Design a protein around this motif. Structure first.
Motif, PDB file in Angstrom:
ATOM      1  N   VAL A 139       9.723  14.033   5.057  1.00 58.36           N
ATOM      2  CA  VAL A 139       9.370  13.982   6.469  1.00 58.36           C
ATOM      3  C   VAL A 139      10.050  12.783   7.110  1.00 58.36           C
ATOM      4  O   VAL A 139      10.225  11.734   6.479  1.00 58.36           O
ATOM      5  CB  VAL A 139       7.843  13.926   6.652  1.00 58.36           C
ATOM      6  N   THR A 140      10.445  12.946   8.370  1.00 58.59           N
ATOM      7  CA  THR A 140      11.207  11.946   9.102  1.00 58.59           C
ATOM      8  C   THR A 140      10.527  11.649  10.431  1.00 58.59           C
ATOM      9  O   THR A 140       9.789  12.479  10.967  1.00 58.59           O
ATOM     10  CB  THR A 140      12.649  12.414   9.350  1.00 58.59           C
TER      11      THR A 140
ATOM     12  N   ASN B 127       0.820  -1.205   0.000  1.00 60.69           N
ATOM     13  CA  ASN B 127       0.000   0.000   0.000  1.00 60.69           C
ATOM     14  C   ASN B 127       0.856   1.259   0.000  1.00 60.69           C
ATOM     15  O   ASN B 127       0.548   2.227  -0.704  1.00 60.69           O
ATOM     16  CB  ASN B 127      -0.935  -0.022   1.203  1.00 60.69           C
ATOM     17  N   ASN B 128       1.938   1.260   0.776  1.00 59.85           N
ATOM     18  CA  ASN B 128       2.819   2.421   0.903  1.00 59.85           C
ATOM     19  C   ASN B 128       3.679   2.558  -0.355  1.00 59.85           C
ATOM     20  O   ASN B 128       4.900   2.396  -0.343  1.00 59.85           O
ATOM     21  CB  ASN B 128       3.671   2.281   2.155  1.00 59.85           C
ATOM     22  N   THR B 129       3.013   2.902  -1.458  1.00 58.67           N
ATOM     23  CA  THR B 129       3.645   2.886  -2.769  1.00 58.67           C
ATOM     24  C   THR B 129       3.533   4.209  -3.520  1.00 58.67           C
ATOM     25  O   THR B 129       4.224   4.384  -4.529  1.00 58.67           O
ATOM     26  CB  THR B 129       3.041   1.754  -3.622  1.00 58.67           C
ATOM     27  N   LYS B 130       2.721   5.151  -3.049  1.00 56.67           N
ATOM     28  CA  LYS B 130       2.523   6.398  -3.774  1.00 56.67           C
ATOM     29  C   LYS B 130       3.827   7.178  -3.887  1.00 56.67           C
ATOM     30  O   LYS B 130       4.660   7.169  -2.978  1.00 56.67           O
ATOM     31  CB  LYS B 130       1.467   7.252  -3.075  1.00 56.67           C
ATOM     32  N   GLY B 131       4.002   7.854  -5.022  1.00 55.03           N
ATOM     33  CA  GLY B 131       5.175   8.671  -5.254  1.00 55.03           C
ATOM     34  C   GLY B 131       4.833   9.799  -6.199  1.00 55.03           C
ATOM     35  O   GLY B 131       3.762   9.820  -6.811  1.00 55.03           O
ATOM     36  N   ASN B 132       5.757  10.749  -6.317  1.00 48.61           N
ATOM     37  CA  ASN B 132       5.518  11.922  -7.149  1.00 48.61           C
ATOM     38  C   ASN B 132       6.846  12.402  -7.728  1.00 48.61           C
ATOM     39  O   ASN B 132       7.857  11.694  -7.691  1.00 48.61           O
ATOM     40  CB  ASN B 132       4.801  13.011  -6.343  1.00 48.61           C
ATOM     41  N   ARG B 133       6.836  13.625  -8.254  1.00 45.43           N
ATOM     42  CA  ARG B 133       7.948  14.215  -8.989  1.00 45.43           C
ATOM     43  C   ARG B 133       8.651  15.343  -8.255  1.00 45.43           C
ATOM     44  O   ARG B 133       9.866  15.492  -8.385  1.00 45.43           O
ATOM     45  CB  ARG B 133       7.448  14.751 -10.336  1.00 45.43           C
ATOM     46  N   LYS B 134       7.921  16.173  -7.512  1.00 45.98           N
ATOM     47  CA  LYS B 134       8.513  17.428  -7.068  1.00 45.98           C
ATOM     48  C   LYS B 134       9.649  17.197  -6.082  1.00 45.98           C
ATOM     49  O   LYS B 134      10.597  17.985  -6.042  1.00 45.98           O
ATOM     50  CB  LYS B 134       7.440  18.346  -6.481  1.00 45.98           C
ATOM     51  N   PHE B 135       9.588  16.121  -5.294  1.00 48.30           N
ATOM     52  CA  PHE B 135      10.713  15.797  -4.423  1.00 48.30           C
ATOM     53  C   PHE B 135      11.974  15.529  -5.233  1.00 48.30           C
ATOM     54  O   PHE B 135      13.045  16.075  -4.938  1.00 48.30           O
ATOM     55  CB  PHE B 135      10.387  14.589  -3.545  1.00 48.30           C
TER      56      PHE B 135
ATOM     57  N   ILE C 295      26.304  14.911  13.996  1.00 47.17           N
ATOM     58  CA  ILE C 295      25.805  14.313  12.768  1.00 47.17           C
ATOM     59  C   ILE C 295      24.434  13.725  13.070  1.00 47.17           C
ATOM     60  O   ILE C 295      24.119  13.409  14.221  1.00 47.17           O
ATOM     61  CB  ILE C 295      26.755  13.208  12.259  1.00 47.17           C
ATOM     62  N   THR C 296      23.614  13.581  12.034  1.00 41.06           N
ATOM     63  CA  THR C 296      22.421  12.756  12.126  1.00 41.06           C
ATOM     64  C   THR C 296      22.239  11.999  10.820  1.00 41.06           C
ATOM     65  O   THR C 296      22.706  12.428   9.759  1.00 41.06           O
ATOM     66  CB  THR C 296      21.160  13.562  12.455  1.00 41.06           C
ATOM     67  N   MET C 297      21.553  10.862  10.915  1.00 44.12           N
ATOM     68  CA  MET C 297      21.523   9.878   9.838  1.00 44.12           C
ATOM     69  C   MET C 297      20.183   9.159   9.899  1.00 44.12           C
ATOM     70  O   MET C 297      19.947   8.371  10.819  1.00 44.12           O
ATOM     71  CB  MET C 297      22.690   8.906   9.993  1.00 44.12           C
ATOM     72  N   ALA C 298      19.311   9.422   8.928  1.00 46.40           N
ATOM     73  CA  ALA C 298      18.003   8.782   8.877  1.00 46.40           C
ATOM     74  C   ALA C 298      17.646   8.461   7.434  1.00 46.40           C
ATOM     75  O   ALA C 298      17.826   9.300   6.549  1.00 46.40           O
ATOM     76  CB  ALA C 298      16.928   9.680   9.499  1.00 46.40           C
ATOM     77  N   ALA C 299      17.148   7.251   7.197  1.00 40.75           N
ATOM     78  CA  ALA C 299      16.712   6.867   5.862  1.00 40.75           C
ATOM     79  C   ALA C 299      15.380   7.532   5.549  1.00 40.75           C
ATOM     80  O   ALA C 299      14.442   7.471   6.350  1.00 40.75           O
ATOM     81  CB  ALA C 299      16.585   5.350   5.754  1.00 40.75           C
ATOM     82  N   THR C 300      15.298   8.179   4.387  1.00 43.17           N
ATOM     83  CA  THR C 300      14.123   8.959   3.999  1.00 43.17           C
ATOM     84  C   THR C 300      13.659   8.560   2.605  1.00 43.17           C
ATOM     85  O   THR C 300      14.108   9.132   1.604  1.00 43.17           O
ATOM     86  CB  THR C 300      14.419  10.454   4.051  1.00 43.17           C
ATOM     87  N   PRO C 301      12.756   7.586   2.500  1.00 47.85           N
ATOM     88  CA  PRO C 301      12.228   7.213   1.184  1.00 47.85           C
ATOM     89  C   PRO C 301      11.434   8.346   0.555  1.00 47.85           C
ATOM     90  O   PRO C 301      10.707   9.075   1.233  1.00 47.85           O
ATOM     91  CB  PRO C 301      11.338   6.005   1.489  1.00 47.85           C
ATOM     92  N   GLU C 302      11.572   8.481  -0.765  1.00 51.77           N
ATOM     93  CA  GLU C 302      10.846   9.528  -1.475  1.00 51.77           C
ATOM     94  C   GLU C 302       9.355   9.232  -1.514  1.00 51.77           C
ATOM     95  O   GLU C 302       8.531  10.146  -1.401  1.00 51.77           O
ATOM     96  CB  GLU C 302      11.398   9.676  -2.892  1.00 51.77           C
ATOM     97  N   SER C 303       8.991   7.958  -1.677  1.00 54.46           N
ATOM     98  CA  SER C 303       7.581   7.600  -1.781  1.00 54.46           C
ATOM     99  C   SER C 303       6.829   7.939  -0.501  1.00 54.46           C
ATOM    100  O   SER C 303       5.737   8.517  -0.547  1.00 54.46           O
ATOM    101  CB  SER C 303       7.444   6.112  -2.101  1.00 54.46           C
ATOM    102  N   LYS C 304       7.402   7.595   0.653  1.00 51.32           N
ATOM    103  CA  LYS C 304       6.771   7.925   1.923  1.00 51.32           C
ATOM    104  C   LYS C 304       6.839   9.415   2.218  1.00 51.32           C
ATOM    105  O   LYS C 304       5.963   9.939   2.914  1.00 51.32           O
ATOM    106  CB  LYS C 304       7.436   7.142   3.053  1.00 51.32           C
TER     107      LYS C 304
END
Lengths: 168, 176, 168, 168, 168, 168, 168
Positions: F124-125, E3-11, F108-117
């Protein structure tokens, strides 16, 4: 090979259970030591040993070449060498200078407080793992800083005459 | 049961339920009912009776593999009856599967089935090559299939006995 | 395994803050030593130790086998071994030769001046980390240069009799 | 090379059979030690040695410079150093404190019980591999925990005066 | 599917713009490393090493075995392998000749000089990107010349060490 | 052939659904590692190392040489190699410049940030996936720049050490 | 050519039947390794290590230097590298989070479960092929995430140690 080689398991297995159930094993690293009135600065200690406790034995000889061992006085006094660390301005230096100026006696408390059982806000001890030491005689030793001691800082060693051990 | 379940493909009908290696009971404090009478090897062998023993470790065992085959042929053993009983059971399920089946290829399929199962038998060692090459040859299992009419087809198979080394005698000597 | 194994974090965490907030750690390498009137050449020292300070203990025995410890004289005197380096013409050689000719006494100053707090044009010390030494008795020792000492230069060792320590 | 180099095999082969048939080899690790009434806690021991047994020799000299050796008294007494482990609350600490308070004597039993021959529910010994020790004089020693002792726990060492050895 | 699959372009656009706002990048092959007044040998350099500036660290421990590290002085030592290719006249051999005859020290500088940014008659440089190595020791290292593989010419290399990192 | 050969579908479908119910997975390339207030240099990071949190272990032995391991404090040390690519203005060189001038610590800080989420204006983190490294020492490591292989630009790398694993 | 060349068929058929009577073989990829009550993280395992059970050996010598080895206890230690792949919600990070917070031990089980043999709603398992790891220490190991090679996602790995080999 040898005919008498085969063994059973449940023996050593219950043995293992008993061993693993005796109780958790306490690291030598864990320790806390506090002075009389300077516990704010006593945290700086890093290497020390529990005060030695023992009583002497009189070895007597009797007829028929018999050897025998008997009680004597408690060997309550002796020496303890410890390793610590100083500060920017020399907390320990000023402390020992003031101590030698005052020409007084000091009392110390040693304890082992595992963090697992720690509760409250600060470390809480138990009577089992705490020893109070009286008539402590504190002095320091010259510390040699080498040429290649690029990664090594000063390690102040202190020699401490201890007189008699009390357990609470 | 232990001998048969120790193997999964073909089972342990080749082995016997004799000796302390397999047959052990040792219930408790074994003693004879009557100490006066004694066994007689010729008597039990004639009467097809199985005599008992105690193992090297001291457990009560049955040291025999003799059936009620009164005739003194090779069928008096235990592995022989078990072996053809097992192979006959194999024929049982093979007839089960080939029954009512239209003709033409069923004979051939049964041929390959028989050959492969005899092959795993000899690989297990339950079947061995004949000891006499002159008459019995040196081939373990011989198969033949014939047909006569709409009905009356026949399958025949021949095999070879396998040793178990029942009776063994030892002789001493002084080197002087 | 052991039921008494689980612990908390905030205890050791505030602990960690306290330790990391005690103060910056001083390397043993940092040091400065100056003679009386030859501080221009005193920089050449590389290995030394702070003068040992201690006071002796009288160990007495009383009735009932009791041990006791009592104050004694300050152990203000002793020996200090240091390691240095010479020059093209032997600054230290001429200096010790002149010293033994004059048959005089010398005064030395030792200090620990971290570069972080250094201000001005030259290194500035503080009373906390400075010790003045009086009645210093300077002498050198024979230095052995080996066969395979291709990458090793002369390391002049000096023995110094020190008498009494003053702190400013 | 040398003419006298060729040898036979069956000699060393039967030799090997005799060696491999002497009997199974017993590891030094296997050991059990029990106190008098505290065998429940005696399992914690890890390092010890069998009590030394020997008798002294009188070395006499006679005419024509002849040397001779003669029997003397049994060297039945001496010292044994052992290594053990403590618990959360200090079983051994309380035990030695109670021992020194009581000022009593203790008896110990040592044995070697290979697990192969162990039978029943608990380890069973044989008279061949057990020694009883009498008039044992138990004391402990100060144990030093270092700075880098991250993976090392406390190893309590005990010094034990032994008087005379009995074998069952 | 998930479900967590939505994505876009502006990022991805904004991040692309952010990472492209940096500018282009300096290639490893474009730079300038030269001696002091010996540019005609300097041009013979093929491949080198970036100079390094680092600080020693002191690794102290706090109680129950925790650790903490502290800054120190600079590790001013530094090593670079330099690569060159030699001509008929042996500029490399005459250079190694004359400075090993001199038995003195050498001075180097090393600054990346992009052609695109370069202006004027020759590439212009800025003190931000200028790095100079003075008081350096240049020696030779055993580099095998592959006579079997004729397709490769001589592959001279030398070894340069700087005692201190010269940085503005 | 082999009799134990039967198979079906519903098992593999059940396992497929189970393993697909997890969701998507975070790619190694997608994350964010930034300094404290220096994002314009932070964007220059290329490849890094995951921080680690571990606990020391004490390896004690039980009788006949069996063993047993026990928990200890955290091994709070940690080292990460960081990779960057440098531009003309030398953001990397000016950064190394100014913090080696400061001679201080870095955060330092280090967090994985998927574009889709990610949503909002910027990714957002959440504190579950946020990891921050404070009180860190950043130094340089000798990385050879391949001048021969022109197709590769400069390949700057540095090394960061954190004294403690900062974890919520 | 060579005379000893004759060959036939029935040997190779007999050996083929013998080696085919074994049945199918268990593939490395098909098995199940799970925690105690944490199957939703367990399903994240990728690649693991077989547990090992071994015995110490004593290496004694017989005369003229011949040797002989003897059985001992079990080497009950064991280490397994475990491989996982992490998702957006960070099941791996929350797991490492909460058990490093718990500071306790973990229990594992490891049994190969072929799909063909499996029956019922879920794969059925037998105690012959069930292997369970209890009282285990799970910690993290430094695994580099290849940011350059985007085609590979995160590659989390951990390390598990068991004190004893649990075997029925």
């Amino acid at each position: 090979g040898h005919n008498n080689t085969k063994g059973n398991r449940k023996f050593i297995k219950g043995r293992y259970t008993a061993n693993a159930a005796k109780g958790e094993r306490l690291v030598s690293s864990e320790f806390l030591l506090t002075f009389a009135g300077h516990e704010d600065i006593s945290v700086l200690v890093r290497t020390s040993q529990i005060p030695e406790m023992t009583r002497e034995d009189v070895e007597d000889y009797g007829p028929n070449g018999v050897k025998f061992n008997q009680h004597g006085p408690i060997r309550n006094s002796g020496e303890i060498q410890v390793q610590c660390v100083e500060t920017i301005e020399g907390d320990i230096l000023q402390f020992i200078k003031d101590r030698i100026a005052a020409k007084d006696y000091v009392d110390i408390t040693m304890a082992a407080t595992p963090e697992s059982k720690s509760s409250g806000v600060n470390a809480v001890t138990k009577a089992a793992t705490t020893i109070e030491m009286l008539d402590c005689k504190i002095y320091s030793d010259a510390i040699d800083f080498s040429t290649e001691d690029v990664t090594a800082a000063v390690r102040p060693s202190l020699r401490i005459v201890y007189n008699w051990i009390e357990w609470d | 049961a232990r001998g048969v379940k120790k193997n999964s493909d073909v089972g342990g009908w080749h082995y016997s339920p004799a000796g302390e290696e397999r047959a052990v009971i040792a219930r408790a404090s074994i003693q004879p009912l009557y100490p006066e009478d004694t066994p007689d090897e010729e008597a039990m062998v004639k009467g097809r009776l199985n005599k008992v023993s105690v193992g090297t470790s001291g457990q009560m065992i049955i040291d025999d593999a003799l059936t009620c085959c009164t005739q003194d042929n090779y069928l008096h053993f235990q592995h022989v009856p078990s072996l053809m009983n097992a192979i006959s059971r194999f024929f049982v399920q093979l007839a089960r599967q080939m029954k009512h089946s239209p003709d033409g290829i069923t004979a051939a399929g049964l041929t390959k089935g028989m050959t492969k199962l005899l092959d795993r038998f000899v690989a297990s060692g339950a079947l061995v090559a004949p000891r006499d090459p002159d008459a019995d040859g040196t081939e373990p299992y011989v198969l033949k299939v014939t047909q006569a009419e709409f009905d009356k087809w026949e399958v025949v198979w021949a095999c070879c006995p396998t040793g178990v080394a029942r009776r063994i005698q030892g002789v001493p000597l002084l080197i002087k």
